Paper text:
SaPIs are clinically relevant pathogenicity islands, residing passively in the host chromosome under control of the SaPI master repressor, Stl. Some Staphylococcus aureus phages encode dimeric instead of trimeric Duts, which are completely unrelated at both sequence and structural levels. The crystal structure of the ϕDI Dut described here represents the first structural characterization of this group of dimeric Duts, revealing particular features. Remarkably for unrelated proteins, our results indicate the de-repression mechanism used by dimeric and trimeric Duts is conceptually identical, involving dUTP as a second messenger turning off Stl-Dut interaction.
To validate this idea, we obtained the three-dimensional structure of ϕDI Dut in apo form, allowing us to compare this with the dUPNPP bound structure. The apo ϕDI structure showed a dimeric organization that, surprisingly, presents a “closed” conformation almost identical to the dUPNPP-bound form. This was confirmed by the minimal differences observed when both dimers were superimposed (RMSD of 0.36 Å). The major differences are observed at the C-terminal helix α8, where electron density is poorly defined for the apo structure’s last fourteen residues, indicating that the region is highly flexible. Similarly, the last five residues of helix α8 of the dUPNPP-bound structure present poor density, confirming the high intrinsic mobility of this region. These minimal changes could represent the transition between “open” and “closed” conformations in phagic dimeric Duts. Although to a lesser extent, the nucleotide seems to stabilize the C-terminal helix of the phagic dimeric Duts, similarly to the dUTP-induced ordering of C-terminal motif V in the trimeric Duts. Oppositely, the binding of the nucleotide seems to have minimal conformational effect in the ϕDI Dut, which presents a “closed” conformation in its apo state. Therefore, the absence of the major part of the mobile C-terminal portion, which also provides several phosphate interacting residues, would explain the fixed closed conformation observed for the ϕDI Dut.
Author numbering:
A (entry chain A): 2 to 156
B (entry chain D): 2 to 159
Write the structure that this text describes.
Amino acid sequence: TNTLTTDQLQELLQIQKEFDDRIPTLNLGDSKIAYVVEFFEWFNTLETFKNWKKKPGKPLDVQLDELADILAFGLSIANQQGFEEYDRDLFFESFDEEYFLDFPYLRNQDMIYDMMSEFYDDDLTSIRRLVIVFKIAEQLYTIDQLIDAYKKKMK
Amino acid sequence: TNTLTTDQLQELLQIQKEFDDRIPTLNLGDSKIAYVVEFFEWFNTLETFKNWKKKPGKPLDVQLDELADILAFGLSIANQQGFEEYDRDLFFESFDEEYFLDFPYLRNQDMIYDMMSEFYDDDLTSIRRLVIVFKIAEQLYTIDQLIDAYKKKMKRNH
C-alpha cells in the first residue's frame, strides 16, 4: 500500500547487518562516501539532464536496482552508528512530516545541487539518509518496489 | 607525453564544438549537471572507498573512458560560455599554479567532499572544471592517455 512500518524497517536493518557482518573492514567513512556515489549513479538513471536523448530514463528495473544500492548504504550507516528505537521514532516523525521531497522536485534535474549541499555537510544524519531514499521510493516508485529490488539484491 | 599545449587544447575545444553543433537541444545548465554526474561515475571506477573488495579499481581503459566524459562536458561548458585566447591563457596560468591536486590527494577517497564543495558553488568556473580534469589526468594517468580516450570517444559518438 506504499507505506513503511517499523517492522519492515527493522527487518531491512537486520538483512543489512547480516550482510555487513561478513565485512571485517567495514567503516563509516567509506560507507558514507558510497552512499553519495550510489546516489549519483541512481540520479544518472533518471536522465533528467540528458536533453540529447529522445526517450530519457533507463528502464524502471535499472532505476530501482540503483535506488536499492542507496538503501543498502543508508541501512548500513544507520547500523554502524547505532539505530535503536529512539532513532526509528525520529525517522518516522521526520518521514511523515517531510513534504519538500515530492514528485515534481525529484523530477527537477536541479535537485542534485540541493543533495550535494547536504552531502558535504559532515553533520548529515543516518535518519536523513534513510528519509531521502524512502521518500524517493514513495514519491517516484513505491516503497514495495524498492524493498523488492533490495531483497533481490541481497539474496 | 604528460604535458598540455595550447595547440592541443584548441584542438580538443574544436572537436567538442563540432560534436555539440549537432545537438540542437544543447544547454549550459544540463551540461553543468552532466559534468558533476560524470565526475562521480569516474570516481566510482577508482573504488578507493571500497574496502570490501580485495583489489579495488575498474580496468584502466574504463577509468580513462569515464575521465574522458568529464573532459567532454568541461570542454562543452567552456565553448558554450565562450572561450577565447584570453581564457586559454588564464587556464594555463591556473593549471600551472595548481599544486593541491596531486597523486596523494586523488588517492584519498575523502577528496570527493572537497570536489562536492566546488560543484555546489554557483560560481565554479569553466577554467576550474578543466584544471580539475587535466590535473587528474596528469597526476593519476597521463594527459596523452586522456586525450587519446577522448578522441576515440568522440569518434564513436558521431
